[model samples]
Target: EFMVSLPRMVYPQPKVLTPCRKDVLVVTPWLAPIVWEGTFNIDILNEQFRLQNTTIGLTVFAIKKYVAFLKLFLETAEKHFMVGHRVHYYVFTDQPAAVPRVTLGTGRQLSVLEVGFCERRFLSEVDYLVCVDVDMEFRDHVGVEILTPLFGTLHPSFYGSSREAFTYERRPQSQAYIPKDEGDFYYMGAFFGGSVQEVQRLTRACHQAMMVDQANGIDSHLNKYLLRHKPTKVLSPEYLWDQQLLGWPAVLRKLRFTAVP
Candidate 1:
C-alpha cells in the first residue's frame, strides 16, 4: 500500500550530494525521519497525498473558557492547516453554541462532536487524525510532509534536554512508569497523530495504562506510551512552540503552530 505514483509535475531536483540539516539529528536511532524545515519537499509530499484524495480529520478540544480561542484557531487554520486537502475539523466541545462560525474553504468541513471528548465517532470518517490543542494557531506552512503511519512531536521544552531531565513517570508501581535512562525524547502529548488505526491503538493503549496507574494512585502519563511504542515519524519542535517562552532560536527555521499567547 505504500507504493503510489504521482501525476506528471516538476520540482527542484534533490541533490544527492547535499545534506539537509547538518546541525541536527535528522533521523532517530530507530531510523524514523525527524521532520524539520528544509528536510522535505512539500510540493512533492502534497502531490503524493493529493493523489490519494486524502481526508485528514483534525481534532481539537475546547472546554469551558477554552472555547474563546476557537475563533482565532479556526481563522488561522483556514490559512495554514492542510490548505488544499479534504479536511474535517472535528471540534470537540462541551458548549456547542459557543463554538465560533468560521467559514471554511472549499473541500474543508467542521463537525462539533460533544462532551465533546468522545472521539470514537471520527474513526470511520477520516483517513488520518491529527490530535492537537485548541489554544494555539498556525503561523506557517503545515502541510502533508507530516503525514505518516504514526508520529509524535518533540516537546519544545525538552527537545534539547537529556533523558534524565524528562518528565516521564518514574514510579515502578505505575503502569506508565518509565526508567530515567529509557527515553529518547519527551514527545509532547499536545500534538500527536497518524493513520486512524495507529492513533486509535496509541490513545486506547495509553488510556488503559493511565487507568491502571490511576488505580494505583499515581499520576503517570503519555510519555510512557511513546517510550514503549516509538512513533514511525518524529516531528521537530517546530511543529509545536511557544515563542513567548522560548524565543526564535537559530535551530528552528520555521514556527508552524504556536501558543496563542
Candidate 2:
C-alpha cells in the first residue's frame, strides 16, 4: 500500500532540443559533436573565443625530406587558417635555420623548436593546440570553431566506409585494437586538436599504449587511440584531404585543407 506521505516519483517529461544543424549529422552515437561547416556560426564563435584572448598553437613536424612542404604549408596557413585571431605556429624541425620567414600578422609569430620538445613546451603557452601534417595547405577557412577539449579530423578516404573496411590496428595483441563491429569514423592521424592539457593526456596515453605494443614488436596506428578514446569533437573530412589524389567527392561541401605533392 502506498503511503499518502510518500512522494510519488513522476517521470520527467521529454522535450526536444533543436540542433542548429538539423539537416546534417551533428552528433554521433557516443554523443560527441560532429563539427561540420553548418554546425556553427563562425561570427559568434570568433567573438566568444576572441573575448578570452584565445591563443591557438599550431604544431607541425617537418623533418629531413619533408621540410620541402613547409613553404606552401605556412603560406596557405597564413591565407586561411585562424585569421583575425592570435596564432602561434610552433614548427618542429631538425634544422632551425631552414625555417621559412613568412611575414606574420601583428599578433602572430612563428618559432622553430626541436622536434622532441614540441608538445612539452607548447603546454605552457597556448590555450589550444592544433597539430597537422606539414604536407598540407589550408585551401579554405578553418577557424576557432574547431577548438575543443579534444578533437579528431575524419579520414577523407574512410569517412563513408564501413567499420570492417577501416585500417585500424587489426592485431588483437595490440592496445589500439577495436573490434570489427565498433568504430564511429576513421580519424586521420594527420590532424588533431584540443586544449593543451587534453592533448598532453592524449599523447601520453597513446605513447603508453605504443610502448606496450612496442614491447611485443608491434606499433599501433594513431587512429586506434583516436577512435577508441573518443574525442569531444570530430572534424569533417574537409579539414584534411588530398584533392589532387582523391578528387572532388559529392559529399564534401568544401575542401578546406589539401595535401601538396
Which numbered prediction scores highest in TM-score against the true structure?
Answer: 1
What is the C-alpha lDDT profile of model 1 across 69-152, one tens digit per residue?
Answer: 999999999999999999999888999999989999999999987783445566667889999999999999888888888999
Model 2, 131-178: lDDT tens digits are 899988899999987888999988888887898998887889998988
Poorly placed runs, candidate 2 (over 4 Å): 1-24, 115-120, 219-221
| TM-score versus the correct structure, for each prediction | 0.95, 0.87
Output the TM-score of candidate 2: 0.87
Clash totals for all models, in order? 0, 0
